[PDB]
Design an enzyme around this catalytic site. Structure first.
Site, PDB file in Angstrom:
ATOM      1  N   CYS A  81       0.808  -1.211   0.000  1.00 37.48           N
ATOM      2  CA  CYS A  81       0.000   0.000   0.000  1.00 37.48           C
ATOM      3  C   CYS A  81       0.845   1.267   0.000  1.00 37.48           C
ATOM      4  O   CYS A  81       1.531   1.572   0.974  1.00 37.48           O
ATOM      5  CB  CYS A  81      -0.938   0.040   1.199  1.00 37.48           C
ATOM      6  SG  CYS A  81      -2.142   1.399   1.074  1.00 37.48           S
ATOM      7  N   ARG A  84       0.079   3.945   2.736  1.00 31.47           N
ATOM      8  CA  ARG A  84       0.360   3.662   4.138  1.00 31.47           C
ATOM      9  C   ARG A  84       1.370   4.640   4.739  1.00 31.47           C
ATOM     10  O   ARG A  84       1.618   4.620   5.944  1.00 31.47           O
ATOM     11  CB  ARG A  84       0.881   2.235   4.305  1.00 31.47           C
ATOM     12  CG  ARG A  84       2.314   2.046   3.838  1.00 31.47           C
ATOM     13  CD  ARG A  84       2.838   0.666   4.200  1.00 31.47           C
ATOM     14  NE  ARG A  84       4.109   0.383   3.540  1.00 31.47           N
ATOM     15  CZ  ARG A  84       4.935  -0.592   3.899  1.00 31.47           C
ATOM     16  NH1 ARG A  84       4.629  -1.388   4.920  1.00 31.47           N
ATOM     17  NH2 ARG A  84       6.069  -0.774   3.239  1.00 31.47           N
ATOM     18  N   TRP A 242      -7.862   6.727  -1.973  1.00 33.61           N
ATOM     19  CA  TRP A 242      -8.153   7.321  -3.273  1.00 33.61           C
ATOM     20  C   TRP A 242      -7.235   6.709  -4.324  1.00 33.61           C
ATOM     21  O   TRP A 242      -6.249   6.057  -3.991  1.00 33.61           O
ATOM     22  CB  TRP A 242      -7.973   8.847  -3.227  1.00 33.61           C
ATOM     23  CG  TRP A 242      -6.684   9.312  -2.600  1.00 33.61           C
ATOM     24  CD1 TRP A 242      -5.442   9.299  -3.171  1.00 33.61           C
ATOM     25  CD2 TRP A 242      -6.514   9.868  -1.288  1.00 33.61           C
ATOM     26  NE1 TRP A 242      -4.513   9.813  -2.298  1.00 33.61           N
ATOM     27  CE2 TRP A 242      -5.145  10.168  -1.135  1.00 33.61           C
ATOM     28  CE3 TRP A 242      -7.386  10.140  -0.229  1.00 33.61           C
ATOM     29  CZ2 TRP A 242      -4.627  10.729   0.033  1.00 33.61           C
ATOM     30  CZ3 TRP A 242      -6.871  10.697   0.930  1.00 33.61           C
ATOM     31  CH2 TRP A 242      -5.504  10.986   1.052  1.00 33.61           C
ATOM     32  N   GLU A 247      -3.353   3.738 -12.174  1.00 34.47           N
ATOM     33  CA  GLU A 247      -4.340   2.670 -12.275  1.00 34.47           C
ATOM     34  C   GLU A 247      -5.687   3.216 -12.735  1.00 34.47           C
ATOM     35  O   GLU A 247      -6.328   2.648 -13.621  1.00 34.47           O
ATOM     36  CB  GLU A 247      -4.501   1.972 -10.923  1.00 34.47           C
ATOM     37  CG  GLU A 247      -4.929   2.896  -9.795  1.00 34.47           C
ATOM     38  CD  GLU A 247      -5.154   2.153  -8.492  1.00 34.47           C
ATOM     39  OE1 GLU A 247      -5.288   2.819  -7.443  1.00 34.47           O
ATOM     40  OE2 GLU A 247      -5.199   0.904  -8.516  1.00 34.47           O
TER      41      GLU A 247
HETATM   42  C1  HEM Z   1      -5.341   7.125   1.025  1.00 31.54           C
HETATM   43  C2  HEM Z   1      -5.011   6.500  -0.218  1.00 31.54           C
HETATM   44  C3  HEM Z   1      -4.497   5.220  -0.411  1.00 31.54           C
HETATM   45  C4  HEM Z   1      -3.740   4.939  -1.478  1.00 31.54           C
HETATM   46  C5  HEM Z   1      -3.282   5.937  -2.539  1.00 31.54           C
HETATM   47  C6  HEM Z   1      -3.491   3.539  -1.493  1.00 31.54           C
HETATM   48  C7  HEM Z   1      -2.863   2.916  -2.554  1.00 31.54           C
HETATM   49  C8  HEM Z   1      -2.690   1.542  -2.629  1.00 31.54           C
HETATM   50  C9  HEM Z   1      -2.065   0.894  -3.747  1.00 31.54           C
HETATM   51  C10 HEM Z   1      -1.431   1.584  -4.953  1.00 31.54           C
HETATM   52  C11 HEM Z   1      -2.081  -0.427  -3.487  1.00 31.54           C
HETATM   53  C12 HEM Z   1      -1.467  -1.513  -4.342  1.00 31.54           C
HETATM   54  C13 HEM Z   1      -2.481  -2.181  -5.248  1.00 31.54           C
HETATM   55  C14 HEM Z   1      -1.824  -3.086  -6.274  1.00 31.54           C
HETATM   56  O1  HEM Z   1      -1.103  -4.025  -5.869  1.00 31.54           O
HETATM   57  O2  HEM Z   1      -2.028  -2.853  -7.486  1.00 31.54           O
HETATM   58  C15 HEM Z   1      -2.697  -0.611  -2.201  1.00 31.54           C
HETATM   59  C16 HEM Z   1      -2.906  -1.852  -1.606  1.00 31.54           C
HETATM   60  C17 HEM Z   1      -3.460  -1.996  -0.344  1.00 31.54           C
HETATM   61  N1  HEM Z   1      -3.922  -0.955   0.463  1.00 31.54           N
HETATM   62 FE1  HEM Z   1      -4.013   0.985   0.046  1.00 31.54          FE
HETATM   63  N2  HEM Z   1      -4.066   2.913  -0.402  1.00 31.54           N
HETATM   64  C18 HEM Z   1      -4.709   3.939   0.285  1.00 31.54           C
HETATM   65  C19 HEM Z   1      -5.469   3.716   1.446  1.00 31.54           C
HETATM   66  C20 HEM Z   1      -5.598   2.471   2.105  1.00 31.54           C
HETATM   67  C21 HEM Z   1      -6.312   2.266   3.345  1.00 31.54           C
HETATM   68  C22 HEM Z   1      -7.116   3.346   4.056  1.00 31.54           C
HETATM   69  C23 HEM Z   1      -6.089   0.990   3.732  1.00 31.54           C
HETATM   70  C24 HEM Z   1      -6.556   0.311   4.865  1.00 31.54           C
HETATM   71  C25 HEM Z   1      -6.856   0.932   6.161  1.00 31.54           C
HETATM   72  C26 HEM Z   1      -5.255   0.395   2.720  1.00 31.54           C
HETATM   73  C27 HEM Z   1      -4.854  -0.951   2.735  1.00 31.54           C
HETATM   74  C28 HEM Z   1      -4.272  -1.582   1.641  1.00 31.54           C
HETATM   75  C29 HEM Z   1      -4.031  -3.012   1.567  1.00 31.54           C
HETATM   76  C30 HEM Z   1      -4.209  -4.022   2.698  1.00 31.54           C
HETATM   77  C31 HEM Z   1      -3.552  -3.259   0.330  1.00 31.54           C
HETATM   78  C32 HEM Z   1      -3.207  -4.608  -0.287  1.00 31.54           C
HETATM   79  C33 HEM Z   1      -2.167  -5.439   0.461  1.00 31.54           C
HETATM   80  C34 HEM Z   1      -0.747  -4.938   0.263  1.00 31.54           C
HETATM   81  O3  HEM Z   1      -0.532  -3.708   0.332  1.00 31.54           O
HETATM   82  O4  HEM Z   1       0.156  -5.773   0.036  1.00 31.54           O
HETATM   83  N3  HEM Z   1      -4.968   1.298   1.716  1.00 31.54           N
HETATM   84  N4  HEM Z   1      -3.087   0.619  -1.664  1.00 31.54           N
HETATM   85  O1  LIG Z   2      -9.239  -3.053  -6.766  1.00 32.31           O
HETATM   86  C1  LIG Z   2      -8.753  -2.263  -5.777  1.00 32.31           C
HETATM   87  C2  LIG Z   2      -9.525  -1.196  -5.279  1.00 32.31           C
HETATM   88  C3  LIG Z   2      -9.030  -0.400  -4.234  1.00 32.31           C
HETATM   89  C4  LIG Z   2      -7.758  -0.667  -3.679  1.00 32.31           C
HETATM   90  N1  LIG Z   2      -7.301   0.041  -2.623  1.00 32.31           N
HETATM   91  C5  LIG Z   2      -7.918   1.061  -2.011  1.00 32.31           C
HETATM   92  C6  LIG Z   2      -7.151   1.464  -1.004  1.00 32.31           C
HETATM   93  N2  LIG Z   2      -6.058   0.704  -0.984  1.00 32.31           N
HETATM   94  C7  LIG Z   2      -6.154  -0.167  -1.979  1.00 32.31           C
HETATM   95  C8  LIG Z   2      -6.990  -1.735  -4.196  1.00 32.31           C
HETATM   96  C9  LIG Z   2      -7.487  -2.528  -5.239  1.00 32.31           C
END
Ligand code: HEM
Ligand SMILES: Oc1ccc(-n2ccnc2)cc1
Ligand code: HEM
Ligand SMILES: Oc1ccc(-n2ccnc2)cc1
Lengths: 300, 300
Positions: A81, A84, A242, A247
């Site tokens: 993420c 994060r 957001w 993507e």
């Molecule tokens: C505020 C904007 C946020 C952005 C820009 C963001 C962006 C991303 C992106 C780019 C990914 C990778 C997706 C991929 O593999 O293609 C991701 C994965 C993920 N995000 Fe976020 N995220 C945000 C908020 C959050 C929030 C609020 C949570 C949870 C409280 C969260 C939890 C996760 C989890 C668990 C994953 C997938 C597991 C991993 O990271 O290995 N994200 N996020």
């Molecule tokens: O298909 C999705 C949609 C949102 C996703 N996301 C929101 C926040 N962090 C991950 C990831 C993958």
């Protein structure tokens, strides 16, 4: 290599106490350690109460503040993420007293309202009741809160190819398929382990950015992961951030032109600044789950 | 006699179009024929799209539904499989978008979780990317997903005699050998034709039945066969069923006492009933392959 599984599956019985207790103790330590040198007597008092509760009820309940801390640490612990980096910018909605699918629907409506915020996207998570025996799970069957349907003769797909299977499931569940390129899927909501119920999302709740015919929704929300904390499992805990811009040029332009938040440089800088403002195996952790239509035992 | 080879070996170049096309056409006929008299226009439209795709990309992609049908027909076509009498009881996991060995590992973790199901075994297959030029194969080097190591001075073996060679390979690959009777071997995973990487299976993912010291794992999964369909080859497609009782009294007793599925009479009857419920050279086919350490060209 000794990687851990990123998937956490179903249970048919409560977590055994000899397993739960050490995990609870460790989480409580992490929570009170975040106060550095303060609150030693509070820490010990909480260890006592949690242990008695586990021994007497077979499980325990987090305080609201423990829950909030856990959702943020799990976010901080999410390897892929990009968002994060500002893990303190998270609004938590406590739905642990939810009972029905109708109530789940209302909670999700509130989440979408708050998070979308007319385009000024805010990160949020809604936490539904924790797993008890594993036979009364709350689950969202959707992969995302908002996502377009995908329809399959020539082998090509109309809509989102990633939702072919789930889309077919909605139809089988009685949802009436249009066949457009941008049909927002219904919410498929499971409460207390019961068969899932189908809920159309009120269209006015869905903010879309028009890009040619191209179009897309503003709110990226993961619907289908499980939050683990202190040995407790929350199989229903939708969250959103957001979008990243990546993507296409037209996309970056259209979101910005319609004033829908994306992770451009300004937003990255602004949210990180706000994060720093708040400054005044991994656990907790978000796990993947097995798609619930592959594991669910139908009541009827 | 004109038996066919039950082994399908490696390639150094893509299947020639003049070879691929007739096989694709024939598979598509088999798939649409399963709809008897329906979908003639759909059949023809699919023939068109598949042909253009082959002529333009050199290959083609199955739809999810074609893939599912193929895995089940290949199972139905397995001569020695006693479980093939209920070939419709098969869960398919589509990993055709897999890129790395780390991702292969996570897919296999999900498979083991789902299939083991706390002892209530469910049949599953996970399908990784199809062979392209034959130089970018995905392979599992294990014979089964779960299997004990075998160690050889007096010529006798400790552990599984059938894994002597593979066990030695894991050691050579840097895996640290214990020397017990029941050491679960690591997964040895090859992605995109690269040198294989070694992954310990998380012990909690391995369900075992204690029988004296005797013990055994609950999940029989074939790791090393190749699925052929419409001229396409999938060199990585692990699948599992559940054990027959025969492959001793203590065994039949211990599995049943610990509630791990075996093919006893009740299970045979139950699974066949479920199969009949779903009712509302051979191709496709599972081939053997040459053990990959005998054919692999090491990058380093
Ligand atoms: C505020 C904007 C946020 C952005 C820009 C963001 C962006 C991303 C992106 C780019 C990914 C990778 C997706 C991929 O593999 O293609 C991701 C994965 C993920 N995000 Fe976020 N995220 C945000 C908020 C959050 C929030 C609020 C949570 C949870 C409280 C969260 C939890 C996760 C989890 C668990 C994953 C997938 C597991 C991993 O990271 O290995 N994200 N996020
Ligand atoms: O298909 C999705 C949609 C949102 C996703 N996301 C929101 C926040 N962090 C991950 C990831 C993958
Ligand atoms: C559900 C329980 C199942 C049972 C009880 C079962 C049982 C068996 C048995 C007894 C054998 C013979 C092994 C030997 O020769 O000693 C076998 C072989 C085999 N099985 Fe299964 N099986 C099951 C599920 C599956 C599944 C899900 C697949 C694939 C989708 C499958 C594919 C095969 C293949 C390809 C072989 C070897 C080739 C051959 O049969 O000639 N089986 N199985
Ligand atoms: O060594 C094995 C293991 C599993 C097997 N199997 C599982 C399902 N079908 C066959 C066959 C042989």
């Amino acid at each position: 290599m000794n990687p851990k599984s990123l998937t956490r599956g179903p249970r048919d019985k409560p977590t055994p106490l000899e397993e739960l207790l050490p995990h609870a103790i460790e989480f409580i330590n992490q929570y009170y350690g975040s106060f550095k040198e303060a609150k030693i007597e509070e820490h010990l008092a909480r260890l006592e109460a949690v242990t008695k509760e586990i021994e007497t009820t077979g499980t325990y309940q987090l305080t609201l503040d423990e829950l909030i801390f856990a959702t943020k640490m799990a976010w901080r612990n999410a390897p892929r993420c990009i968002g994060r980096i500002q893990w303190s910018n998270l609004q938590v909605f406590d739905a642990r007293n939810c009972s029905t699918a109708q109530e789940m629907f209302q909670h999700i409506c509130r989440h979408i309202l708050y998070a979308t915020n007319n385009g000024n996207i805010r990160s949020a998570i809604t936490v539904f009741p924790q797993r008890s025996d594993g036979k009364h799970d709350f689950r969202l069957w959707n992969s995302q809160l908002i996502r377009y349907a995908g329809y399959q003769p020539d082998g090509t797909i109309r809509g989102d190819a990633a939702t072919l299977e789930f889309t077919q499931l909605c139809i089988d569940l009685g949802w009436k398929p249009r066949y457009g390129r941008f049909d927002v899927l219904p919410l498929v909501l499971q409460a207390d382990g019961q068969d899932p119920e189908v809920f159309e999302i009120p269209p006015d709740l869905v903010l879309e950015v028009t890009m040619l015919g191209l179009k897309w929704y503003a709110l990226p929300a993961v619907a289908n992961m499980l939050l683990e904390v202190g040995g407790l499992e929350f199989p229903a805990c939708p969250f959103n951030g957001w979008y990243m811009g990546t993507e296409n040029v037209a996309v970056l332009h259209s979101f910005q032109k319609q004033n829908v938040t994306i992770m451009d440089h300004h937003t990255a800088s602004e949210s990180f600044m706000k994060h720093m403002q708040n400054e005044y195996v991994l656990s907790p952790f978000y796990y993947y789950q097995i798609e619930p239509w592959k594991t669910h035992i139908w009541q009827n």
